UniProtKB/Swiss-Prot annotation, chain A:
The gene is GNAI3. This is Guanine nucleotide-binding protein G(i) subunit alpha-3. Its main location: cytoplasm. One of its GO terms (molecular function) is GTPase activity. The lineage of its organism: Eukaryota, Metazoa, Chordata, Craniata, Vertebrata. Changing G35R: In ARCND1; likely pathogenic. SUPFAM superfamilies: P-loop containing nucleoside triphosphate hydrolases, Transducin (alpha subunit), insertion domain. Belongs to the G-alpha family. G(i/o/t/z) subfamily. The modification Deamidated glutamine is found at Q73. Changing L31A: Increased affinity for PLCD4.
UniProtKB/Swiss-Prot annotation, chain B:
It comes from Homo sapiens. Coiled coil: none annotated. GO terms for molecular function: GTPase activity; GTPase binding; protein-containing complex binding; signaling receptor complex adaptor activity. The chain holds residues 107 to 340 of 340 of the full protein. The modification Phosphohistidine is found at H160. This is Guanine nucleotide-binding protein G(I)/G(S)/G(T) subunit beta-1. GO terms for cellular component: cytoplasm; cytosol; extracellular exosome; extracellular vesicle; heterotrimeric G-protein complex; lysosomal membrane; membrane; photoreceptor disc membrane. Phosphorylation at His-160 by NDKB contributes to G protein activation by increasing the high energetic phosphate transfer onto GDP.
Swiss-Prot record, chain D:
This is Metabotropic glutamate receptor 4. Coiled coil: none annotated. Interacts with PICK1. Residues 24-36 are extracellular. G-protein coupled receptor for glutamate. Ligand binding causes a conformation change that triggers signaling via guanine nucleotide-binding proteins (G proteins) and modulates the activity of down-stream effectors. Signaling inhibits adenylate cyclase activity.
């Protein structure tokens, strides 16, 4: 019939539109931001803006992409990661003001233990293993101030290191790979993100160009 | 049911309602549903005016497009709910959260009438019997059971020894004689009513099945997996 | 025979020591087909040292052409993938466009099919009959009492090798100038370029002596053996520049 | 780059011995001899800039 004949052309047009949309979305890297409670969730998105999930967009050197902030969500991790299966890059914004606060009334331990537990649950996961988790270090000035005023080994009796700015900023990286079991197909990237200058974004944006190729080589199978 | 309205979920608490039959336009929006704190899991249309949503903060309340606000609120589960199930008579709906229990909820008064427990682990999806005397429930404990509303207990249990995974979705037949339950082994299993025998064995799924749909006539059953393959079985 | 021993040794090392990431960085099937092409270029002289046997002339010409084409195509697709992966990662997230090893084997077989179509057209336009006795270059005045036993497939094979070598040494060197935009550990830009330059200079130094031998009298035996030596040394230097980092990291471990 | 171009020049001059040793008993000897000598010196003068000034041209083309 005429309707059944025009349905073929309508299907062809809608499939062409869907393919165009998929090709446009296949060139946008999907970043998944998460962190602890009020761990610099708003100060990081207010940096590249001038130059309940949250949707943000910003283009750099002719590379447009979308970024998803988890926002405020009090739910379990068994049914929340199923929607986020296949994310290429998970940016964790660890807090540097959680090891000094006292133990919470509801939590069995302080906020730093909850942070490391969330990191362990988001890293030692059986669903996504080929993906990658990057770490962003925010609020470094106040962290250095509070670590020069108050010591850091008083709460961490595991080591006997000194109390400086470089040693403290360098020891927090090696303490994250000991909890990971699979290392041949998983990696963790850590970068320094200052809060005083805006020219640091391009210091980590190219870092994305380091990880994406990885999953691109995931299509190669030569690794 | 009338094919006039359609609504999608979302993790950002944006339950945008859409319609098909529109003048000078294909698909447009008129009202915006908002006010939820937890993530939306599933949505069911009670009728052409009143709809019900399943959020991730133990608020499986009913909503309306005209007023844009919820009418009644359902609460009483210790954990958040992730599945819903309507009834053919359009009078009540059963809801089961991750507390390994399912509760019935009335649309008129809006409160739990009966609680059923007995699952070893949390559940994923629930289905209702076409007649309305009982309802089946699948969980991750590799077990199936149908709680009776009059007997206030389950009739039979569907155990499994060689199955370590769970059930992601459960559904009935046209009248409720045949049982359908999708497992995590990239397939589905068809169970009997009382014999508890795997009469039908499914296969062909490249990825994990998410949810399956059975028509009202019970002729064919469509299944939905993560491999973007909507295969219909008959 | 030294090249056969070396290729057998490197194949044994590849099939025995494959868990290390350095050998896995390069294409497994790619390295296998390149080793097969080098082995074919080696066995060319083994199967050519016999009588002309015009059918054997056709077999030898097809064999050397296929070996040269498959080696050049393997190197070309390697460098093209290394150059294209950077642009694919910079402008897209996951854009598989003939990148899978199956697709690499498919495009290599497509290039081999193109070479076979070319040589089939050449055989259709030129039957390449058995020409063993050459009395035009043999002078009977000084009573030489010698008979030539060289085949008559030299000119066409020479010109086709020259053209294909020019085209491939152009395209591959352009790909090599293209690739060194991002640094990585599997950056085969300088050794590949050096191998291409060595092959080009070998051909450019082989053409004058080849023409002089063809112009000389009673020199039908020298051109074929010097062409064999040139092709064999080109294959040998290619295998050496390919396996030098492999044996280096093997010794380092 | 100096070591690289010197290695290439060494390979070139190593390839110049067989071409002169193999050519014998030919009436076209001196022509091809002077031709190969001229092309050899020309390519040796060319690769001294093609393999040393290419990065120079590149860093010029940057800015």
């Amino acid at each position: 019939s005429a309707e059944d004949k025009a349905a073929v052309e309508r299907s062809k047009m809608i499939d062409r539109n869907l393919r165009e949309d998929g090709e446009k979305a296949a060139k946008e890297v999907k970043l998944l931001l998460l962190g602890a409670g009020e761990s610099g969730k708003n100060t990081i998105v207010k940096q590249m803006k001038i130059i309940g999930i949250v949707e943000t967009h910003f283009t750099d050197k002719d590379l447009y992409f979308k970024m998803f902030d988890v926002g405020a969500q009090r739910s379990e991790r068994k049914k929340w990661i199923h929607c986020f299966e296949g994310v290429t890059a998970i940016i964790f914004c660890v807090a540097l003001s959680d090891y000094d606060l006292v133990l919470a009334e509801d939590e069995e331990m302080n906020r730093m233990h909850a942070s490391m537990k969330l990191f362990d649950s988001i890293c030692n996961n059986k669903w996504f293993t080929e993906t990658s988790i990057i770490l962003f270090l925010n609020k470094k000035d106040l962290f250095e101030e509070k670590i020069k005023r108050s010591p850091l080994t008083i709460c961490y009796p595991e080591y006997t290191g000194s109390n400086t700015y470089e040693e403290a900023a360098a020891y927090i990286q090696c303490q994250f790979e000991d909890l990971n079991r699979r290392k041949d197909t998983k990696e963790i990237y850590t970068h320094f993100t200052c809060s005083t200058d805006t020219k640091n974004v391009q210091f980590v944006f190219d870092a994305v160009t380091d990880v994406i190729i990885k999953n691109n080589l995931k299509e190669c199978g030569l690794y | 049911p009338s094919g006039n309205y359609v609504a999608c979920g979302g993790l950002d608490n944006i339950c945008s309602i859409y319609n098909l039959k529109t003048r000078e336009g294909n698909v447009r929006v008129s009202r915006e549903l908002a006010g939820h704190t937890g993530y939306l899991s599933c949505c069911r249309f009670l009728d052409d005016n009143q709809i019900v949503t399943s959020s991730g903060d133990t608020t499986c309340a009913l909503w309306d497009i005209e007023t844009g606000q919820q009418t009644t609120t359902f609460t009483g589960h210790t954990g958040d709910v992730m599945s819903l199930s309507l009834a053919p008579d359009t009078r009540l709906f059963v809801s089961g959260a991750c507390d390994a229990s399912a509760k019935l909820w009335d649309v008129r008064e809006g409160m739990c009438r009966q609680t059923f427990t007995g699952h070893e682990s949390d559940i994923n999806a629930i289905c209702f019997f076409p007649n309305g005397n009982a309802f089946a429930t699948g969980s991750d404990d590799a077990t199936c059971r149908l709680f009776d509303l009059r007997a206030d207990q389950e009739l039979m249990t569907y155990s499994h020894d060689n199955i370590i995974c769970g059930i992601t979705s459960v559904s009935f037949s046209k009248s409720g004689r045949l049982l359908l339950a999708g497992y995590d082994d990239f397939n589905c299993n068809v169970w009997d009513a009382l014999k508890a025998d795997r009469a039908g064995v499914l296969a062909g799924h490249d990825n994990r099945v998410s949810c399956l749909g059975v028509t009202d006539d019970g002729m064919a059953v469509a299944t939905g997996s993560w491999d973007s393959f909507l295969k219909i079985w008959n | 025979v030294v090249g056969i021993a070396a290729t057998l040794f490197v194949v044994i090392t590849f099939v025995r020591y494959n868990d290390t990431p350095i050998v896995k960085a390069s294409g497994r099937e790619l390295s296998y087909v390149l080793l097969a092409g080098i082995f074919l270029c080696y066995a060319t002289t083994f199967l050519m040292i016999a009588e002309p046997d015009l059918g054997t002339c056709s077999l030898r010409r097809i064999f050397l052409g296929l070996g040269m084409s498959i080696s050049y195509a393997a190197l070309l697709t390697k460098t093209n993938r290394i150059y294209r992966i950077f642009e694919q990662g910079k402008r897209s997230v996951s854009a598989p466009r003939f990148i899978s090893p199956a697709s690499q084997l498919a495009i290599t077989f497509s290039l081999i099919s193109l070479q076979l179509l070319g040589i089939c057209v050449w055989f259709v336009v030129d039957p390449s009959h058995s020409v063993v006795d050459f009395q035009d270059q043999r002078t009977l005045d000084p009573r030489f009492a010698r008979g030539v036993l060289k085949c008559d497939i030299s000119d066409l094979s020479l010109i086709c090798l020259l053209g294909y070598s020019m085209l491939l040494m152009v395209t591959c060197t352009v790909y090599a100038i293209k690739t060194r935009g991002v640094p990585e550990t599997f950056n085969e830009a300088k050794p590949i370029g050096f191998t291409m330059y060595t092959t080009c200079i070998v051909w450019l130094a082989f053409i004058p002596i080849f023409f002089g031998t063809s112009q000389s009298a009673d020199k039908l035996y020298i051109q074929t053996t010097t062409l064999t030596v040139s092709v064999s040394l080109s294959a040998s230097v290619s295998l050496g520049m390919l396996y030098m980092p492999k044996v280096y990291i093997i010794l380092f471990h």
